[PDB]
A paper describes a structure:
Human Shieldin consists of four subunits, [name] (also known as [name] or [name], 211 residues), SHLD1 (205 residues), [name] (835 residues), and [name] (250 residues). As the first identified member of the Shieldin complex, [name] is composed entirely of a HORMA domain, acting as an interaction module in a broad array of cellular pathways. The Shieldin complex acts as the key downstream effector of 53BP1; it not only binds and shields single-stranded DNA ends but also mediates CST- and Polα-dependent fill-ins of DNA breaks. [name] forms a hexamer to drive the [name]-mediated disassembly of Shieldin in an adenosine triphosphate (ATP)-dependent manner, thereby releasing the DSB DNA ends for resection to promote HDR.
We prepared a [name] catalytic mutant ([name]) that can bind ATP/ATPγS to form a stable hexameric topology but lacks its ATP hydrolysis activity as previously reported. By contrast, monomer F is in the apo-state lacking bound ATPγS, leading to the separation of its large and small AAA+ domains, thereby creating a seam in the hexameric ring of [name]. We observe that the N terminus (residues 8 to 14, designated REV7NT) of C-[name], which was not visible in the crystal structure in the absence of [name], becomes ordered in our cryo-EM structure of the [name].3–REV74–[name] complex and is threaded through the central pore of [name]. In this configuration, the highly conserved [name] Trp-221 and Phe-222 of pore loop 1 of monomers B to E, as well as Pro-270 of pore loop 2 of monomers B to D embrace residues 8 to 14 of REV7NT in a ratcheted manner. The structure of the [name].3–REV74–[name] complex reveals two direct intermolecular contact surfaces between [name].3–REV74 and [name] components. The primary interface (site-1) involves contacts between the safety-belt segment of C-[name] and the conserved and negatively charged loop (110-ENLEEETENII-120; hereafter designated the poly-E loop) of [name] monomer B. The second contact (site-2) forms mainly between the loop 88 to 95 of O-[name]′ and the NTD of [name] monomer E.
Author numbering:
A (entry chain I): 6 to 37, 40 to 106, 117 to 206
B (entry chain Y): 3 to 12, 33 to 91
C (entry chain X): 2 to 8, 34 to 50
D (entry chain E), F (entry chain D): 19 to 51, 54 to 77, 89 to 429
E (entry chain J): 15 to 104, 119 to 138, 145 to 151, 198 to 207
G (entry chain K): 15 to 33, 39 to 105, 119 to 152, 199 to 205
H (entry chain F): 229 to 254, 273 to 324
Write the structure that this text describes.
């Protein structure tokens, strides 16, 4: 009789699910028109045609994907924001993590963020995103775990890209799961 | 009055609508009397953040900017 | 065009009080 | 006394039950004449709303009770895991009375009166249930064991039981459920996961039991596989399968004993190698033995008048039953010869399993006679050669 | 106005079907057909299916015997697991709101029959 | 000496307790005089707020003890033990008498030594507890183990002990308790998910012991599910996790040894190949064999009495018992003829287990009697026939 | 006139349930007819015709098919009433046509258990 | 097995077609939904099922016990 160990994917897939998510949201949040409608994860995902931006995401997320794997991350926030780097659309992926159901309910996620353009009011185009990595340690403790990437550097919690406000949450999702408490919600301003 | 359209192919009286071209449901009414009855009604649960925006717990941030277009 | 069954797009009628006939 | 009458109502027939009862009672009282079955009727309503009427063991008596049934058309539903929906449980689910089960109770032939014992067992169960006897003081485990030689129709009798009980006891339970348990798909063996799997299928059994207006029959095939003999087996190398999967079923079945609308039916092959703590938790462990000479003759009859009914054996000769041969006293005569030759085949074809008995006409009409229409005594000769063909074929595979 | 509130209910029913993943066939895609920012079905069989179900409740809804439009999502046993109940007590502001509502209503939540017993959509769901 | 009386509160007998105490006192002073059971009274408060008054083991103008008790109709109240709601039911929870175990202590029939011992054990436990004996100079692990050939009823003994002791100790403790442990929902395939579940069970039980007014009986039905032998797990087949479970269980049983209101009841059949490090962790290891001749007679007498009362046997006859049979010197006569013939059935029914001895009054009316009524000597013969059928059905099944 | 035509359909359906002692002579529309005293049946047939009432407010209608069932509910008889819907003798003339129809023809078992249908003054019978 | 046999069943209900159907090398993976369909088409009649299993005695309960005549072919001939 064979008792046996396990092989978790727990903390990493999230951000790369965010990858799909962000590749979707960068599309849906109307902050990408260089996006193209494609097919992935059995949904009408809208991705980017630029392999250059694909590698930009490789740097931004897929370099920190095992670095984001620390469980200290509270709010993986896609701040959808103007030139001032302050949110209008706080896609707060409040990752309340209790450590294929993940895509079983991110089916609803991707699908409804896709529908979010029927909920998201007309956000002005020409506004970018920042990936605010809310950890359990304030003011960007342990620069190494955030600047893991050699070619891709990181910065501390400088006063501009550290704060957010105007938290009107219409919880477009509350999709609790087994591994994840993906309390995603779109806090409008 | 209650209007039980069994369909979508894969006191109070009941104005059910039959509308057949198949003649093989063999159960409209019990399923109609099933769709009619109220069942264990879960209360409307409420929403709330569990990780708020702490002023004493602050985020991380990477350096580079996206390719603008 | 329409037929009703006081027991073509058919508007049957049920009257839930009578419902002994297991297969209606 | 009492006699039982069962009448097939058509599915496309939808008349009320009491009209059917009145019409069949009218036909009976008009006719009021043994165990033969009606097929011919003389009333347009009764024709379009009945298929057949039958008497189950020539008398004008009126001690008549009517059981009316509907054999359900669709076959089995499937049962899979709750979150491991691929293959974990995969249990079979018959919603009795069912189509594929009719005629089954009639065809089977035994010589130890299993049918009556194993039917009046459930009858007395219901009697003791309705009379409110102290379940703390007189009790039954609701488990019936059947074991014996392979291919001798041991498991056939359980489906016949379930069909006959959901037919006989209609209007006392709207319907019956029959859950066929695959005792080979619940052995996902790595450190007591099968002993945890029995629990889920038994909770589903509980789900189908609490519907207190449905009589449920749980049919376990190869009850030797689920309950392996733990004590006498001097194999400590069995880590937790011989001790934590038999003990994981000896509890879930002692848990349904309190309920009353459940019956456990089990089919076994090996008398030994089964837990002694399960040969006490079975009310009836009845042995189904290989057919005996009179039984073989009766089965061969059933086959031959079946072929005549479908006109295979075109020239219809009266096949004389063994009782008529005893009455005449084995006197050779121009019609009595065929029954005699059948009876010689019966002694010569002794010791075979019922399944090969119900095959033998197939082969005897396969190789030896290609004729689309056959005269008797050549087909009989074809049987008398095909039986020796079966003996030699069995000897061929060593 | 009910001749377009029926199509608003069309919006509702297919968006519920869509977010619930009642089928894996991803037929649904954004459809502003005649400038309506709503995500209907691309099966004209089913668009006209909702059309004539609402057609045959049109001699039936505005007669006001209605006490709740219960769009049941049925089950494998054809069971009302999620009765999306809409109270009949009646300008895009509600529409997106209802859309919003539905979405935020599926927020807490995780084969449809349109039974007809502030558009206060509430979900009677199995516990 | 002391005689004990149990008085049963009906469902709506809410009034009080002391009034019933004094009322039964004047009842006993108006009577003053083997075990008896009152059910029909005269004084209106008695006839309304009392369902039964049993004097269970003459001049009663001596020391007498009362135990007012009221049965609770609650149910399972399962403990989920869910980590992410994916876990399964474990540790079903029974309460102050749940009316399901009522009447159990007297239906079970053993030798005399098996009940008095198992009762004065827990009595002396409290006697020593409240005299303040030194904890670590004379101590016990508070664990009882019952083993015997299967079918002899050793789960009923524990549940009836829980019932009897909850009632017998309603003054020292507010009310009783019982946790039946699901010894097959603790294991888990993954690595070191077993010992954590075992310690989670026992810490939950420890929480349930926090209050000192309850009395907790913890029933582990079949230990060998949990305390599997440690060395016998031979090469390679059994992993290490089959050792962590056993020693975690042993450590926990040692950790809840300090309290005085916990008793752990554990049973297992002739599969007494229990881990020695556990089979030493047991104050009382009692042997529960198969019923003896007198025990068989008493079971059959109770069965016949219940059957007559329930009107399956209409003509009631006064059946004697052994004490008068030895009083009359076994003189054959009309009154004892049926009694002696039942005794002769008993002398030839020696060998079976209790598990079937309480079926036979159901089989002998399920397989050998047709009318739903039958006289004694017309039913008791079918008892002999069913006995012989059970013996043969055992014998030929190897 | 649709209302009084519906009351004459009452007269029809139930007197044809007659055309045994549980029935009684009483004044309807100034003629004595031997029907049933049943108040449940009275208001039930009133309900049948008054649900037929909005149907005729539609004015789109073909027949009022008062199906006299057999006990099997599988018609061995029937009574289609194909009035092409757009003094006392003629309000009794219809009743005499149906009486002469059941005259040349024959009725059904005592409880005719009939279920009125409509297809949305003349008649015949599909026997 | 869903639409292929609906086509075949269209070819079975007629009395004119002697349809025989070959199965090769005997939802998805939580049953194959091939059994229920093939088992139900077994009933139509004039549709005879042949299965080139190519798998030896080791067999599942699903199809090898509803199959009645079973012949073995070994090495090919000269
Ligand atoms: N004794 C019998 N009398 C008449 N028919 C029989 C008899 N035994 C078997 N049959 C026929 O055998 C066919 C199937 O029998 P089975 O019950 O499957 O045998 P079985 O006992 O199941 O063997 P196992 O245990 O499953 S190998 C049925 O079609 C029966 O009609
Ligand atoms: N000595 C006895 N007197 C009366 N009944 C007995 C006796 N022994 C067993 N029984 C009857 O046995 C019936 C069931 O007993 P169980 O306790 O379920 O047996 P048991 O020992 O669990 O068996 P395991 O769990 O397999 S040892 C009870 O209802 C008892 O009546």
């Amino acid at each position: 009789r064979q008792d046996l160990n396990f092989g978790q994917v727990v903390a990493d897939v999230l951000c790369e699910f965010l990858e799909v998510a962000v590749h979707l949201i960068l599309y849906v949040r109307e902050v990408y028109g260089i996006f193209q409608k494609r097919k992935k994860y059995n949904v009408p995902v809208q991705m980017s045609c630029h392999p250059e931006l694909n590698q930009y995401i490789q740097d931004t997320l897929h370099c920190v994907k095992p670095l984001l794997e620390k469980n200290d991350v509270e709010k993986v926030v896609v701040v959808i924001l103007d030139k001032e780097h302050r949110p209008v659309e706080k896609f707060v992926f409040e990752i309340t993590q209790p450590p294929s159901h993940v895509e079983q309910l991110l089916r609803a996620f991707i699908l409804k963020i896709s529908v979010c353009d029927a909920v998201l009011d007309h956000n002005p185009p020409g506004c970018t995103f920042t990936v605010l990595v809310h950890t359990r340690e304030a003011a960007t403790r342990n620069m190494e775990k955030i600047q893991v990437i050699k070619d891709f550097p990181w910065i501390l919690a400088d006063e501009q890209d550290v704060h957010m406000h105007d938290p009107r949450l219409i919880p477009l999702k509350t999709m609790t799961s087994d591994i994840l408490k993906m309390q995603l919600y779109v806090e409008e301003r | 009055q209650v209007h039980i359209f069994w369909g979508a192919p894969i006191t109070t009286e009941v104005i059910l609508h039959y509308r057949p071209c198949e003649s093989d449901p063999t159960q409209l009414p019990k399923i109609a009397e099933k769709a009619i009855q109220d069942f264990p009604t879960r209360p409307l649960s409420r929403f709330i953040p569990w990780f708020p925006y702490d002023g004493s717990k602050l985020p991380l941030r990477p350096k580079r900017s996206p390719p603008a277009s | 065009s329409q037929v009703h069954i006081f027991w073509t797009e058919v508007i049957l009628h049920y009257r839930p009080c009578e419902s002994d006939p297991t297969q209606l | 006394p009492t006699v039982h009458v069962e009448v097939h109502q058509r599915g496309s027939s939808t008349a009320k039950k009491e009209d059917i009862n009145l019409s069949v009672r009218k036909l009976l009282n008009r006719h009021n004449i043994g165990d033969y079955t009606w097929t011919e009727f003389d009333e347009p309503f009764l024709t379009r709303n009945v298929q057949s009427v039958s008497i189950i063991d020539d008398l004008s008596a009126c001690t008549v009770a009517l059981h009316i049934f509907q054999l359900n058309e669709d076959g089995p539903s499937s049962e899979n895991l709750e979150e491991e929906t691929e293959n974990i449980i995969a249990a079979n689910h018959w919603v009795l009375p069912a189509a594929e089960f009719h005629g089954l109770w009639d065809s089977l032939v035994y010589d130890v009166e299993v049918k009556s014992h194993l039917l009046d067992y459930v009858m007395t169960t219901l009697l003791f249930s309705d009379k409110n006897v102290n379940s703390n003081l007189i009790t039954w485990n609701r488990v019936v064991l059947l074991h014996g030689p392979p291919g001798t129709g041991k498991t056939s009798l359980c489906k016949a039981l379930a069909q006959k009980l959901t037919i006989r006891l209609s209007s006392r339970y709207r319907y019956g459920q029959l859950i066929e348990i695959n005792s080979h798909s619940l052995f996902s063996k790595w450190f007591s996961e099968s002993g945890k799997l029995v629990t889920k299928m038994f909770q589903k059994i509980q789900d189908l039991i609490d519907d207190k207006d449905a009589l449920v029959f749980v049919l376990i095939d190869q009850v030797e596989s689920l309950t392996a003999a733990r004590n006498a087996c001097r194999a400590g190398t069995e880590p937790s399968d011989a001790i934590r999967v038999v003990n994981a079923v000896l509890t879930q079945i002692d848990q349904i004993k309190r309920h009353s609308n459940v019956v456990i039916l089990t089919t076994s092959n090996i008398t030994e190698k089964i837990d002694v703590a399960f040969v006490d938790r079975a009310d009836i462990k009845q042995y189904i033995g290989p057919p005996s000479a009179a039984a073989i003759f009766k089965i061969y009859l059933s086959c031959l008048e079946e072929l005549m009914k479908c006109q295979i054996i075109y020239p219809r000769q009266q096949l004389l039953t063994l009782r008529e041969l005893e009455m005449i006293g084995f006197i050779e005569n121009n019609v009595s010869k065929l029954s005699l030759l059948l009876n010689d085949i019966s002694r010569k074809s002794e010791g075979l399993s019922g399944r090969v008995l119900r095959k033998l006409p197939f082969l005897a009409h396969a190789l030896y006679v290609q004729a689309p229409t056959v005269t008797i005594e050549g087909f009989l000769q074809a049987l008398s050669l095909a039986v020796d063909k079966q003996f030699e074929e069995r000897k061929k595979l060593a």
